[PDB]
Amino acid sequence: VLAGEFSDIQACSAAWKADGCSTVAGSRPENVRKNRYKDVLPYDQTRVILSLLQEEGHSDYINGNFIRGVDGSLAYIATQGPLPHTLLDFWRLVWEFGVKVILMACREIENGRKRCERYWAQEQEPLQTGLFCITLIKEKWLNEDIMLRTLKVTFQKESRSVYQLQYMSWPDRGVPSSPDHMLAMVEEARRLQGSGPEPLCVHSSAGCGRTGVLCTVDYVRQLLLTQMIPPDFSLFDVVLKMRKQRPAAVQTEEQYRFLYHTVAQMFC
Template sequence: MSQVAENLRGFLARVEGAKYKVGEDTLTKEFQEIRNRSAAFKQDNDYSTEAGGSQENLKKNRYKDILPYDQTRVPVTFLAEEIGSDYINASFIKGVDNQPRYIATQGPLSHTLVDFWRMIWQYQVKVIVMACREVEQGKKKCERYWPLDEEPVLHGPFAVSTVAKVKVNPEVVFRNLKVTFQEETREVGHFQYIAWPDRGIPDSYSCFLEMIKLVRQHQGQHSTPMCVHCSAGCGRTGVICTVEYIQTLLHKQKVPSDFSIFEVVMEMRRQRPSAIQTKEQYDFLYHAVTEMFEKQLNDLNHNYENLKQNKTPYYDDVAPQLKTSHAMAVYRKNEHSARTSLSLEGSDMNDMYAKVQKKPPPPSSSLSLPTTTENQSPTSSHHQYDNFRPRPIISKPAEQLYSTVPPKPNRSSVRPVSSSYAVIDTSGPPEATSKELSQGTIPSAAIKKTLSIDNMRVNNRWSQNIASNYTVISECHARSLDEYEDVTDPAKSRPPTEGIGFNCRIGKPKGPRDPPPEWIR
């Protein structure tokens, strides 16, 4: 379907193949390689931690071994002249567009709450993701920086209040915070994952992926970074940043053919130390990404089937060109329907109808075909067919004459026929029994005699219609079928009231009785 789908399938195939390597734990080897390479960063001058390790800033770190790199640390210059320092234990992590997408930071300490809100205000953060509780296993993991009720809480010059609180799922809570500095007020969305133990993994992949999706939706098109933190700002924080990064790759259809979680994690660790801290978290990352890719492929297949059936796709991430082709198909279908309706009901079509037809249509609000009731005689049919002469009877075998029903004549497709019509004699008709007539075994001599009602003593009403509707043709002239005889001519032997209608060459039986088997065969 697309190159992105092929890349996703390729990654899933590699992951599936790694499971069947006997005696080899691929993920364990990968994570050990990540730790080995990360340890080598300390020997590189590009990964220094002088700012975090300085004597004046050591007290601002929750853990002494988790310090931000100087090259990626977040400087807080807002109100720095009053506070006296621009340091906070936080690191920038780039997103898909190679711009700072995340601020990975530690959980605020009691004496760094003002620094935390200075950072949020300076970088105009719209979303905060918290991956821990305030207290875990009896230890303080993060200072609460929001109020429990609507009453605002002051953190230095910042007034913070909770506008609303919603439980997204059993493991995620969302709060809408309002932050006021002087006379300016901003709203900040706060997601807290309450079921993620320290150095562990969440209990549910679905709840976790749902939170990541909501975070991206809440962030929207804002170019400002989102703030992600746990207690140390590395293990759980690294998992969230990595999964959100990969989900953005999916959304923008930028998953490369050589996509590797190993390389993504290594890139995270180059910007934030110890990102994804344990082997268990690395396993969780693989499972979460695999589930996300499988769901994306299912959505692509579902959208493809909808487009094949000329249906609207259910998901907003469908490629624009597919939506355009679907819209054009619907437009052409509606255009065809509009033209058909116009040809039947439009005034322009009525004008053209009046020019083409020899006679104007009867005055009515809608076009309809002439109808005839069951009790109507052939002479009371539509006036346009009153003067039509029936098609002459051509000499045929009796089986063909009585066992088949000839089609109605079509004036637009008739052709001149030969004048060699059979002459039916009227002298002394032989006797024809009802059995011979119904079975189609009438002698050939009988066909040349008069078919009168007296000689056709048959109980079949279908035979009576034949006898009453067919006249004796005494002579035959060479003429085309387009020339019709006026059956109402007084010179004819049959009275005008018994004129023949257009459809009465072989009458269809009327009444409850069924036609003979030869007629319906």
């Protein structure tokens, strides 16, 4: 049943690609090297467009897409784990859109390969990326699987606080080592986010499966906490819409099943 539903979801994604969900910007010769993976490009229709430092001739491109939230606002930015040479673009994104919380679902190294560059911290070790200065104010464990880093970010004489939550043990294609710790991540993200329309920044290595699982869980939790559930509410519909905004948002049958069980638990 769930396996049939997820298969239907993949059929629709395949159809969208054949029909022409476009990927022109991501395919520009000036942009190709900014993609972590050749097979994961952001859809033009929902891609994140960077205008910070425009006047200086900086490119508008980053491999990342907006995903709409329960209220129809632009509630998430789903993006890849930054590369050595797109760290500056990552911070441009965080700064332009007033991001207060970053959720990271991957590690720097997975399966022996580099999966995401460190863009934060560390203790007594500030990070300078272009005109950005990142300083580690404090860090601590939210729980055994999640680090919470409090960052001071400085750009053009202005300073902001940005929080980063990193989940340590969630493999690509699969599910988190602790489902309760994942929910605690989302809960703490929301506490830090507070009120305010700024999007949450969510990323994994590719910005697909683990990223989409997180966004979906927050989406449904927000629905549960803030709105009346539509009498025809459907997880199929939600995930389908997610995939329409970010490629392979929810990448795998396993993750789709995980989502269903998690959502049913949240509803109770």
